[PDB]
Amino acid sequence: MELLGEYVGQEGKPQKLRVSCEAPGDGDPFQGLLSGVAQMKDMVTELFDP
Amino acid sequence: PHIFTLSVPFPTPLEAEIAHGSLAPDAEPHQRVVGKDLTVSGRILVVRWKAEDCRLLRISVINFLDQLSLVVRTMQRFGPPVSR
Amino acid sequence: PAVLGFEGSANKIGVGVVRDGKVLANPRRTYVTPPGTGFLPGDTARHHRAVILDLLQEALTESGLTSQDIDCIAYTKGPGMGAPLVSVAVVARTVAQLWNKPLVGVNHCIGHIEMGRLITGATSPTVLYVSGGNTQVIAYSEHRYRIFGETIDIAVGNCLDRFARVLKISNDPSPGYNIEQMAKRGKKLVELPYTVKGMDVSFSGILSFIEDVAHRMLATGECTPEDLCFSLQETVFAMLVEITERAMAHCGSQEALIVGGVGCNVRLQEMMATMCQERGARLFATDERFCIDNGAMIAQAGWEMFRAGHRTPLSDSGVTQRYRTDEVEVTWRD
Amino acid sequence: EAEALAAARERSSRFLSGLELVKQGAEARVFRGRFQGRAAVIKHRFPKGYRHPALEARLGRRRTVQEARALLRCRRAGISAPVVFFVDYASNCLYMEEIEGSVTVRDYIQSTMETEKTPQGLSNLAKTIGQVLARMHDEDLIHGDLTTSNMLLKPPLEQLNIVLIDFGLSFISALPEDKGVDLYVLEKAFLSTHPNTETVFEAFLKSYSTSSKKARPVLKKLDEVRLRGR
Amino acid sequence: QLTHQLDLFPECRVTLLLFKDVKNAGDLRRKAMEGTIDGSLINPTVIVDPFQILVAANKAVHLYKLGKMKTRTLSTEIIFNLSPNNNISEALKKFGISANDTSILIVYIEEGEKQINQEYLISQVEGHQVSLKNLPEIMNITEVKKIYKLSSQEESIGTLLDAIICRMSTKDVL
């Protein structure tokens, strides 16, 4: 129940990331979902570009 | 042999099947070294990408994830997923 | 049934809402650009994504229909651009899997020609067809669409629009319009290559040549650009209508229609009319916006490619960079 | 100047008033009559089409001049070709003499199948036709549309002497691309006018491609046409 | 002699005469140039038929009665319109009368009432009247085809009338 992902190339070490989503009941989780969208974009960029 | 697995949590299996399908059948402009593995598990969707060069890798990642984001904005503006 | 023609190919986007024989909504945000810079795979996509939900909602509220009153999601199967089409597509596939609709691929050019069949309403005429990516003289012969006129390099739409580009005219609404109404005020036409090689054209020789004019149009100051406008009007409209009546009398046809990237011009209407009077043939009119790549034409061609029963494999479909109308299997007609 | 053109109007009215129909259509006018005692016929290209002046004259002029040059170079090379009298492009007229023995390779293939079964003498006609088309393609004067109805025969009716005519849609810069285009139109004419002559056409193809040391890139470009439809 | 009814600009009447027993260089050529001879004087040893003359004379009539012609006189035009050699110097010199003949062909073209007495010219030039069937006898093929240089392969499928016709058609566009 959270935006969950994991990268392993030939490093053999787990690069596991995940971010929480908006708990429903005060709104739809999709807002926290787009939040995690932006988050994962930032993460994949800042990790892979350098 | 760069591998990248990711578990998107959805509310219902409806979004599981949808976001599995609506991005699978495209033989991507670049699968030359990229394998797209879309496995639905309940209401979660696991997706595993396989690549050999990180540039087109990142392009696939972010392009997909924004096709995702667009499925999301549609499930906010037309959805959330209807029972089918 | 209703069809969401989800077209955007290179510099365009649009939602053709086709239902009950009318193109209810053909909205757009013509991706108008700095002078003569376009044909984008990337920012076309950025633009189209940013605006596409807005355009969907616009077309839907104009039509007043719901996500359960639309009956098809026709994405342009090709030949478009790479990223513009997949970004066009993911919405098509998603609203299909969600609204409970089927993904359907549709050829691009057959869309132009089907909207022409809605424009003409004549007995299976040959069609000179030209857009930003086509130079064909077509007739539906032997169960398929037969290519009698085929370029190798460029296209009358592509040609006239790249010309109006390299002269930095106001890209809106269509460079063709600018070269059309920029014409009448120039004289002293010249001789540019006339290359008709039996039933096939090679428009490349046209375009490049006019480029080599601009230099001496500024280095000597003894010629105006309106000259170039009227001259290319006369020349290329001649070539096209000449081979049109030729391949017309060949197949026993006396009809002619011009659709696509350059149909906005009216000089072509005149020359087609004259070649028709002389050889006893009849012409058909033309227009600006309809022969510009809306989203309505792909919805139209989807009406046929979909009413028949042609479905795309839900497990494989989408990206194309060439998809020819004799690589098709047209079935809705014998 | 316009006075000479009025006199030309007068002569065009005089020579061409009271003559029977021969044929007229679509980039061709053709009549028939006498010339100083001899027999002759007429072939006419024209600035009689209206799209724009200042080119239409150039158009008709270059058209008829090309046809005249083609007939001359053809019959002077050695190919059997008709004889021309004089070329007055001031109205784009053509006076061509008739060669007697009116029969086409179309008519031959039509008639000789009554005695021929599993074509053998027709395959030999195909041998000869390949010989003569390679002979034309020695310096590659493109008939621009080879056909079964474009090959006449002059007697004797045994040595197969045949004439090639109507070089109006012509050019001599032969590109194996356009050459394959020609050979394709050729095969299409075979299949259309003649049902299932694969033995005939194969005899013909082998005869030509043997008698012609050039058909290889031509047929390769033809194969290129086969996968794109040109 | 015999008179005809030309076509393709028909307003003229062409007439041919054949004479013999001539030997002189300057006086007769000057007689021709001075117009005191109103016919057109040609050697007999390069011609094959009166039909070549007829075609060249029709060329002359047509290009004259428009004035567009390179020429200005009907008489001198046919002589160039026989030889397809675009170098008009030799197309006038050789194909015309030289001092290498004991016989001459005369071509006259008549319009309306412009009449030139026959006995007048018969007196003007020395020679005996001979009928027009003597062409093949003086015809020396060894030198006739020297100006055509035509291929025997073309001769295989026809006569030498149309072989010499097919090439006189093309000296104008090229």
UniProtKB/Swiss-Prot annotation, chain A:
Answer yes or no on keyword Acetylation. yes
- What name does UniProt use for this protein? EKC/KEOPS complex subunit GON7
Q: What does this protein do?
A: Component of the EKC/KEOPS complex that is required for the formation of a threonylcarbamoyl group on adenosine at position 37 (t(6)A37) in tRNAs that read codons beginning with adenine. The complex is probably involved in the transfer of the threonylcarbamoyl moiety of threonylcarbamoyl-AMP (TC-AMP) to the N6 group of A37. GON7 plays a supporting role to the catalytic subunit OSGEP in the complex.
What disease involvement is noted?
Galloway-Mowat syndrome 9: A form of Galloway-Mowat syndrome, a severe renal-neurological disease characterized by early-onset nephrotic syndrome associated with microcephaly, central nervous system abnormalities, developmental delays, and a propensity for seizures. Brain anomalies include gyration defects ranging from lissencephaly to pachygyria and polymicrogyria, and cerebellar hypoplasia. Most patients show facial dysmorphism characterized by a small, narrow forehead, large/floppy ears, deep-set eyes, and micrognathia. Additional variable features are visual impairment and arachnodactyly.
Q: Which organism is it from?
A: Homo sapiens
Major location category of this protein: nucleus
Q: Which GO terms describe its cellular component?
A: cytosol; EKC/KEOPS complex; nucleolus; nucleoplasm; nucleus
* GO annotation terms (biological process): tRNA threonylcarbamoyladenosine modification
Q: Which residues carry this modification: N-acetylmethionine?
A: 1
| Gene for this chain | GON7
Swiss-Prot record, chain C:
Q: Name one GO cellular component term.
A: EKC/KEOPS complex
Listed HAMAP family? Kae1
Where is substrate annotated to bind? 129-133, 161, 176, 180, 265
What EC number(s) does the entry state?
2.3.1.234
Under catalytic activity, the entry for this protein gives: L-threonylcarbamoyladenylate + adenosine(37) in tRNA = N(6)-L-threonylcarbamoyladenosine(37) in tRNA + AMP + H(+)
Q: Where is the signal peptide?
A: none
Linked disorder reads:
Galloway-Mowat syndrome 3: A form of Galloway-Mowat syndrome, a severe renal-neurological disease characterized by early-onset nephrotic syndrome associated with microcephaly, central nervous system abnormalities, developmental delays, and a propensity for seizures. Brain anomalies include gyration defects ranging from lissencephaly to pachygyria and polymicrogyria, and cerebellar hypoplasia. Most patients show facial dysmorphism characterized by a small, narrow forehead, large/floppy ears, deep-set eyes, hypertelorism and micrognathia.
What biological-process GO terms show up in the record? tRNA modification; tRNA threonylcarbamoyladenosine modification
Q: What does the UniProt entry list as the effect of changing residue 279 to L? A: In GAMOS3; reduced formation of a threonylcarbamoyl group on adenosine at position 37 (t(6)A37) in tRNAs
In Swiss-Prot or TrEMBL terms, this protein is called tRNA N6-adenosine threonylcarbamoyltransferase
Q: How is the cofactor bound?
A: Binds 1 divalent metal cation per subunit.
Curated annotation (Swiss-Prot), chain D:
Q: Which pathological condition is tied to this protein? A: Galloway-Mowat syndrome 4: A form of Galloway-Mowat syndrome, a severe renal-neurological disease characterized by early-onset nephrotic syndrome associated with microcephaly, central nervous system abnormalities, developmental delays, and a propensity for seizures. Brain anomalies include gyration defects ranging from lissencephaly to pachygyria and polymicrogyria, and cerebellar hypoplasia. Most patients show facial dysmorphism characterized by a small, narrow forehead, large/floppy ears, deep-set eyes, hypertelorism and micrognathia.
Q: Which GO terms describe its cellular component?
A: cytoplasm; cytosol; EKC/KEOPS complex; nucleoplasm; nucleus
> What's the protein here called?
EKC/KEOPS complex subunit TP53RK
Q: Does the keyword Kinase apply?
A: yes
State where ATP binds: 22-30, 43
Q: What is its EC number?
A: 3.6.-.-, 2.7.11.1
Q: In which tissues is it expressed?
A: Highly expressed in testis. Weakly expressed in heart kidney and spleen.
Curated annotation (Swiss-Prot), chain E:
Signal peptide residues on this chain, from the entry's feature table:
none
* Gene3D superfamilies given in the database record: CGI121/TPRKB
Keywords in UniProt for this one?
Cytoplasm, Disease variant, Epilepsy, Intellectual disability, Nucleus, tRNA processing
A GO molecular-function annotation? protein kinase binding
Summed up, the tissue specificity of this protein is:
Widely expressed.
Instruction: Give the SUPFAM superfamilies listed for this entry.
Output: PF0523-like (SSF143870)
Pull one GO CC term from this UniProt entry: EKC/KEOPS complex
From its record, what is one biological process in GO terms?
tRNA threonylcarbamoyladenosine modification
| Transmembrane segments annotated in the record for this chain | none
- Indicate yes or no for the key word Nucleus: yes
Per its UniProt record, which disorder involves this protein?
Galloway-Mowat syndrome 5: A form of Galloway-Mowat syndrome, a severe renal-neurological disease characterized by early-onset nephrotic syndrome associated with microcephaly, central nervous system abnormalities, developmental delays, and a propensity for seizures. Brain anomalies include gyration defects ranging from lissencephaly to pachygyria and polymicrogyria, and cerebellar hypoplasia. Most patients show facial dysmorphism characterized by a small, narrow forehead, large/floppy ears, deep-set eyes, hypertelorism and micrognathia.
**Described purpose of this protein according to its UniProt entry:** Component of the EKC/KEOPS complex that is required for the formation of a threonylcarbamoyl group on adenosine at position 37 (t(6)A37) in tRNAs that read codons beginning with adenine. The complex is probably involved in the transfer of the threonylcarbamoyl moiety of threonylcarbamoyl-AMP (TC-AMP) to the N6 group of A37. TPRKB acts as an allosteric effector that regulates the t(6)A activity of the complex. TPRKB is not required for tRNA modification.
